[PDB]
Design a protein around this ligand. Sequence first.
Ligand code: HEC
Ligand code: HEC
Ligand SMILES: [Zn+2]
Ligand SMILES: [Zn+2]
Lengths: 136, 136
Amino acid sequence: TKVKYPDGFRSWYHVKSMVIQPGHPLENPFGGIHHVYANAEAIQGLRGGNYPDGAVLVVDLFDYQEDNHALVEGKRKLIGVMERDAKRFSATGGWGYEGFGEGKPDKRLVTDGGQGCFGCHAAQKESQYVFSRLRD
Amino acid sequence: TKVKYPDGFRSWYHVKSMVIQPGHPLENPFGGIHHVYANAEAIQGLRGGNYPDGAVLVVDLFDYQEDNHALVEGKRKLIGVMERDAKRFSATGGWGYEGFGEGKPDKRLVTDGGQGCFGCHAAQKESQYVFSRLRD
Ligand code: HEC
Ligand code: HEC
Ligand SMILES: [Zn+2]
Ligand SMILES: [Zn+2]
C-alpha cells in the first residue's frame, strides 16, 4: 500500500506546466516550475474516460532562477505521484499519494498515508481528484 | 524542400521548458512559456548520439497570464520546428527551420528559407545548432 516509484515517467505524455512564484498560497512546498506527466492509463482519464487501475499522474517540480527576465529551470525539488487503485488506495478515494524528494525513489515525502494530499485533491472529486486538464 | 508539420509532436518526449518575460531582449517574438519536444530520432542526437534524417525538434510557445503569483499557460502563439535532412537542408546546416502560427499547419511563418533562424542557431555549431540539453 505504498505508491511504486514511477520509473520512466519523464518519457510520458506532458499534460501541462505552471510556474508557482513566491507569494502563492502553495509556495511551501509547490513553489517552482512544474510539469504534469500522465501514463497511457491516466490519458484515458484525462480524455474523459474513467481513471483505470494503473493510471499514474506525476507532477515534476523544479527550482528556477530569474536571470535577465528569463525563468530558467534549475534543480529538481521533488515529484508528486498519484497512482490509481480503487481497492488498495480506497482510503484516499482510489488514488495513492506519494512525494519523492529530488525525484529519488528513496526520499518518500508522504508521512500520513496521503490524507493531506487527498484533503486538497478532494475539491476535484467531480473530475476524479485531478486538477490538470488536457489541452492541445 | 518544405519542413513537414510535426503531427503528434504533443506526444513526443518533453526535453525542457523556459519562461521568457517582458524585458528579455528576445521578448518579441519569443515571449511566453516554451516547451521543447523531440521525436525518437531527435532523442538519439540530444543524447550525444548523431541526428538521423527525420529527427524533429519542436519549440511550443504559449502566452501566459499572471494569476496570484502563478504563471498559467494561455493560448499557443506558435511552434518552431527543426527537421533534420543533412543534404536537403544543407544551406541551413542540415536542419530545415519553419514556424507555424498558433501551431496551425496552414500558418507557415518563414519567408527566407530559414536563414534568420539559422543565423541565431549558428552560435551553437558545436552541438549541431541545438540550444536545448537533455535533463533528468
Ligand atoms: C492543495 C492545497 C494541494 C495539496 C495539499 C496537494 N496538491 Fe497536488 N495539485 C494541486 C493543484 C492545484 C494541482 C494542479 C497544478 C496544475 O498545474 O494545474 C495539483 C496537481 C498534482 C498532480 C498532477 C495531477 C493533477 O491533479 O493535476 C499530482 C500527481 C499531484 N498534484 C500530487 C500530489 C501529492 C502526492 C500531494 C501530497 C504530497 C499533493 N498533490 C498535495 C493541489 C494540491
Ligand atoms: C536567437 C535570437 C534565435 C532565433 C532568431 C531563433 N531561435 Fe530557435 N532557439 C533559440 C534559443 C536560445 C533556444 C533554446 C531555448 C531553450 O529553452 O533553451 C531555441 C530553441 C529552438 C528549438 C528547440 C530546439 C533547440 O535548439 O533548443 C527549435 C525547434 C527552434 N528554436 C526553432 C527556430 C525556428 C524555426 C526559428 C526561425 C523562425 C528560430 N528557432 C529562431 C534562439 C533562436
Ligand atoms: Zn500577492
Ligand atoms: Zn523579470
